[model samples]
Target: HHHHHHPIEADYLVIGAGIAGASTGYWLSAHGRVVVLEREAQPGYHSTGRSAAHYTVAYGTPQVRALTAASRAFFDNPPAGFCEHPLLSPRPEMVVDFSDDPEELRRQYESGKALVPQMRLLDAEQACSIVPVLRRDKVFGATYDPTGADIDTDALHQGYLRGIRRNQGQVLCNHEALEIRRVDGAWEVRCDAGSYRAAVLVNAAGAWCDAIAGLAGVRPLGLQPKRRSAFIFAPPPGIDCHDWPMLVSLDESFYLKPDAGMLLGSPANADPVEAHDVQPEQLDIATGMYLIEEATTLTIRRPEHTWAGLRSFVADGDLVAGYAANAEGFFWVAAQGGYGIQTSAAMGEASAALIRHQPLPAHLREHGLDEAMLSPRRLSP
Candidate 1:
């Protein structure tokens, strides 16, 4: 059965409907007719949905920190009617060390202080004051960043979807892109659902970015997908944890936070794997339980829920957001790693500026974020 389907034409064709694609589409739609394609039955079914959504000012590489900082303004003051509810809520974060690693603690404080001047270096007693679950005997020291907050990821994602729809953009779910070919200086994408033609293609496929590039006959970036497993367990008996800040290991071993009368914890595993529907490994969960127990007095019986998500990263671990130097009209907005949700607002505006061939936004440019830092050409041989 070789039936030919009429190609739907769009000014901008965006692949994937995660936060990257959704936010980019939200902005790009204002410039032209935008079409976003999502393979899953719904958008954000992968990493975006599975995120332990938090906005920490002093996280990630310098470039990522700049983007996160630039994004805060928007998160705090989104457009009128963007969402029915607030997108961010106050939730501070603390990084505690159990080992006798003064050098590590010093480095952590230095790095964080460089980004957040108000960050406090707290003694074990001060740290325990915020989180009484901490075992005073085993703790060394901690860093507290009161600027961190919990993000309402669903609201943020849906706000972008709403913006796209308001601007007459189309998002097609269950449309898995199978082939992408350049024809007559335009992108011709053949998907499972139908065919599409666009003047430009934006690859925001997250973990599947490399696969999409391969389909388009473009050089593959060394993007790696790392799996992070998380679970939710009942809080220790007779403990009211509504005001506890997020607790993280200075060594990046594990983290725990309050979640709707329960505790959500992760081993913070970043093991590389192929892109697919991810699931939590028992070993990983066990390691998370061990780390949590070792750091705090809480004992875990079993998790009420468990899941895993892929956080994709490039070789250098910075985000990629520019046009392909080799492939014409093919743009990239991938390799966001774990900072995608927090930095979505800035990434969206920056990607739109790049696609439109305009200058970087004043806020981002003033903060030392330029195209050269985020372009794919930096990774070129």
Candidate 2:
């Protein structure tokens, strides 16, 4: 006999319990009945928990940068009692230009200065003084941004999830979607445990967003899943890494950040891979170690720990939101990549604006993101 029991109705159904899903649910709960589902037993079992968790406003495309910039105020001063501790901690970032290519240094300086504040060129002596581990001769110039900070990713995610719960949103874990079918002009989604009926289904499934779309008989958006690996190594004895900024190659190839007493490094590899529970590759660890050694004064003896996270993206590497083409109730919220954590506040609010049939927020329109460019329908061939 058929064992699936379907919910007669739901105002909104979100599939995925990552930061995206949690944020969307939090925002949408005010407008309608919302429920979120996750295949994992707990939230943030995937990319949300595995992120580098840095907040840099000038870090993405113009559209992404706009959204991140808009969201900065929320991170700086989140909603009342939303978090136990401050969500963002001050941690400056610097990009060191080892090669003395004057043109490259000029380009880096100009780009950073235009995008954000307190970003200025630093000579070798000044750069080394900030990060004493630098190979003095290897570093010719540097660009510093005193405003960049470390985001409290876990706290942020929890805050949204708590907000959603406070608004009476439900989250179902260990529930996997098995099939989807259209019935009577409404989408019927069947999970391992039961089924759900909703006028709108949001695909916040991250790497699996396209798969969910295919299951719902909607056209896929050609989302590409890429792998990024990170590892932690203890800093040299007696070196206080707390004051050191998040350091990286001026060419934007690799980066290292202070993680408590140890240093967290990533090669910033973007190899395309099928979506799944990704693990740290030994080769990637070796490559990361090489980059860290070359870029900084820290010598890796043994890593305290290592991990990997996927940075899925569309062909343009921008976030895809709003409704899908030819699919009445299917909405897309995927392809965040490196900016997901920092941009969560604005992204979630934008999605809510669409779901609630409200006018697009003024700032979003001011940034020139209209309905067409922001929708999954734009992905249609």
Candidate 3:
């Protein structure tokens, strides 16, 4: 009788079509119909599209390391036709310290040597030898992780989106979920475009995830979105830097890597702010460039382009991906911090396993991905 109120439906609804949402939908579609909603014109316009495009097992906590390790097989060989090109390329990473004490470099070497056995402890001169631009007097010591590499983020995101479509699922962009609630055993959401209903709802809204949970009558999980600023500038001319390693400050304040022919740099600032279309501040960009110049011999100049992205995290600083203890049929794929893309495949796989009440997959189990570590219940009081 009430045809107008009968909402369009799917087995699962994933809010936010960033890498996390897309990856989750990609896996969910295989079991049942899935619908992914994006607020923007397309996916990945927020943090996913603008992220530090590097991969390494040495960069995160043990939880992140496990997931990153579980994700390797997927990147090494994605589904046939997922992408025409490869996803990973060899790009070594080096952490150079400019301090009187070389303990930081040694500590990093000791912690990561087991995972990244090829990691080398280098003297100041050895550090300068590998990255010629580094100032001799400035370099105290450095550690190189030969296992680090570059990830083709766009390709991976596109591949996951394509996988969803190939499985007969839908990706609805520009349909921001304005209101969400639980109704008659279903989660109903009214978007800007229309209304939708699903038994299972995934809050993979990246920076806006906690807000989304609140709208659905669930308590927010103290999700904090930290802003990071970066810029692209011309490289020092007359030097072939194609083989130059990705350089980072030991203190994690700044980083530089080759952006094709040009140079990309960031101040690595993690400023807290409200969720919105965040932009780069001039001071942050200038400070980042200043750090780059101070650390190396690279000439300073005006940036060709500048941008900012959010890296949201919870209190524990681990990704949240599981059913909500407070709400029925609610799931979380949130709080990825800076490692979402790198840990995505496994996050998606793990989320599916939890959602469908299946055992943890072999890859994840082998890497020691325990459910207690990722449960949203842990965040609840």
Candidate 4:
């Protein structure tokens, strides 16, 4: 079979249009022409859209937390008219523990206090007052981080898309990169939509990142995509729980948040899965319902909706960003795991700075994030 495809050219060719790819492209576009290829009909149709988006300073590892903290300024005060509405709305995070051993809960509270000075340890009654559904007898104690906020994920994603367009960059949906090869010292990308030649090729394909690296003949970073399922159900009758803080199990067993007059809950399962559009498994859903019921008084009869998404991770659980160690003109911006949405802004800025050979931003540098911490070379021998 022979097909003639029109050729396109860009200084930067990014594979994937999810938050990682889009944010990277958005920042890189300031330096040169950028083209982002998304496999789906629209950007963020995968994990990006399915995210239970929230910005918490205490989330992730120290390095990851640094990125999240650095990103706060952007989310709190984006560029003028970046979006019609604010990107962040105050939504406190509450981590509850029901186990007899309260040592873990105390450790988490002490750790969170280091990052968030305002963080406080809440007893069962105090926790119940915030999230009234929590059974005081079931919950022994909790760690509360008042700085957490719900993220307007769509607006943040669209803001990057808009910034890329404003910089004359192109986001081509339904253009899945099929193959990659070096041609005349530049990268040649064969995509479903067309062919593209670029000075630099970025692997930001999320769960498909390792696959993309394989197509490029680059060594895989051992990226694993774990599936996390979530569902929404009506709140207990007449609860009016709009002002409640998000409740999470200290052991990551389950979580609940108020969403559109309903309760959104997740099992916090990190079952390993391959790259694909995942669906909520019955067993996982049942586990979530069971855990929620045990932790709180809310009865889960039926779910209004159910969905699952992949959160890719590496062995070390740090973001992989920077040029590939073995491949020329190939960059990595993958393995963000569950922190992608929360740290997108800082990652974009750091990635763009690296790509353009510029100084790291003051905000990122102040947080002690340098190329070495985020480089793919760390995962290499």
Candidate 5:
């Protein structure tokens, strides 16, 4: 026979090529042979590719902020030649309340200032000065975090992939795992292209994490995949609008950020849906355009581009990681939600520490992240 079939073997099988899986596999390779698998044609086709990521300690839950803060060092001083360009570009994130309540803005200023000491509380005039296109009456007051920065997601992702290969780890794209089982002493994942037997199986499928768990006969974590829709529109001609602070409404119904020379606006919708290739709902896009225009002087016209992506979350709204108590080598790495890109550096390292049966590194522990907090046991009966 010209073709002899033998299962490809590795020490670990990570079942997604997105940032979570890549970062985990990159770190895991140092400990053993790793094989990163992807269901898509290439890695990051789901959320990582579609993200317009921004880093800020001012947004997300306490855990999310801690992970974001922990990632700053990597963003600033990633491995030399990680990419040709700097990973972060400075941007101010301005939060303005269209509602009459000034306390909402003041409360955020108090909280965010604790994390970002240089944060400022701006009156309507100061807020409008940064984004002059704002309708004067629509803004009550604002809190601005000058530490916010736009992220270069692709460079960060590719570098992790590069690291995996550099360490002799294999990345198999389009090798969707159709069936999974624990055979004898190892996990066997039968993929479209080939099958792999490994000592450990990591479920980092992003939106489809639970589905993957089902295939492995593991109980679910109650993950919800919520969609966020965004579109880029040309600014009013001759506005010289590149440096304006990114705007997020107080109620958080809508948001707009400076993307290149255009404006990327979102309805900030979190409508839950079954995991699939999601598209921008017309209603969601129209509402977003309406909200952005209603608050600012900008008018809604033909959008240059439109897209949507899922930010999967567990019920508790924190990350879920650790081996399933019942399934010996089955690890959970889901529920990253909207914090995926910003939390990549920290969470990646955290996942590796979890697999090795070690305590979280000092930086993550300093932020109060512990095994019990990120573990699946917190949800199980």
Candidate 6:
């Protein structure tokens, strides 16, 4: 006997199963039938899963910081039972200054303090107390934000997945998109597993976002993929880092966060690269080791493991989160950079609002969200 498959149909079709797609589906499915597709066997296989999972509203550009601030309510109080454990833990963030360099310290403070009210300047002694391993000789001053938190990345992703399922959404895993075409005023998408159709197609394909648009005959958004390498190392003996906040260099050269009995650090790099699964460069790891030693008192004997991820972004470093200019039904929810996980809630709602023609959500309105900042239509031809 021979079996055949049939094409599936949904009101809304979302590509890529990372935070972008998952969160968009979760919100959109509440009003219409939604289907999400992923090329990998699992969700968040690329950047989302390998994230440093830090939550800081003052970390990025105006649009990026606004999205982060807009997402606070959800992170602090998610929809009921979204996770078995709390989604965010109280892990403040600090940017340590090593030489009492007044100019450097002022630059860092002015850049973030206005947007993040919880931020405060700290003295060398205060910084050392927080990260007990910091050597007194090297430390000078720092900036601390009590609002910075460690996001439970897995839980947050799962929460979106669960929310989607609860709203009757479907997720198709291992479905690599092969072709995308407009058929009878709708999008007809062909993937390795099967074919599907939807009135609206949301491009949340992360690093390959521009490629997806190209395949659909839509104009590219100038999305660039930047590679960043990170490593996980066992903590030094006799130091409990459970309460330590995420530590970052003043210039964002690198960042460190406490993990499960270990410390996770990254070069905070953004070298341009083609879209693909990424692995850590040994040289980057070695360079990170040297930098971490010089910038802080911590000694890095060895790191147990290392990994890398792609942090894609637009030319101006803001996210693309509205309808595409050329394709009537093509929407963009890409170019999140490192802010993907934390800003997922706001962007997801924004995507849904744009599709449904609803008024901007209260959170976005308060944060001064206008279509001019996020519309794919703003891109140059």
Q: Model 5: C-alpha RMSD to truth?
A: 1.6
Candidate 1, clashing residue pairs? none
lDDT of each residue in 140-250, candidate 5, tens digit only: 888898999999999889988988888899998988989999997999998865679998999999999999999999998999999999999999987778998778988
**How far does residue 125 in candidate 5 sit from its true spot (Å)?**
1.0
Count of clashing residue pairs in every prediction: 0, 1, 0, 0, 0, 0
Predicted candidate 4 versus true structure: per-residue lDDT over 257-364, tens digit per residue: 988688899998899999999898999999999999988788988999999999999998899889988688999999999899999999999988887778898889
What TM-score do all the candidates reach, one by one?
A: 0.98, 0.95, 0.97, 0.98, 0.97, 0.95
Question: For residues 91-165, what per-residue lDDT tens digits would candidate 1 score against the true structure?
Answer: 899999888687989888999988889898999999998999899987899999989999999999999998998
How well does model 2 score by local distance difference test? 0.84
Residue-by-residue lDDT tens digits, candidate 2, 1-381: 867665647788899989898888888987788888788998898999988889876576777777777778888988898999999988888888876777888787787688786787899999999998889988998888888989989999989988888888888888777787887767788887688888899889989998998898888889888899898888788888877888878666788898877788988888899999999899989998987788666789988888888899887767887987768888888998888888888889888889777777887677666666677665555
- Model 5 clashing residue pairs (backbone): none
Q: What ranges in model 3 sit over 4 Å off?
A: 1-6
lDDT of each: 0.91, 0.84, 0.88, 0.90, 0.89, 0.86
Q: What is the lDDT of residue 180 in candidate 5?
A: 98
Better of 1 and 3 by TM-score: 1
Model 2 TM-score?
A: 0.95
Evaluated at residue 192, the lDDT of candidate 1 is 69
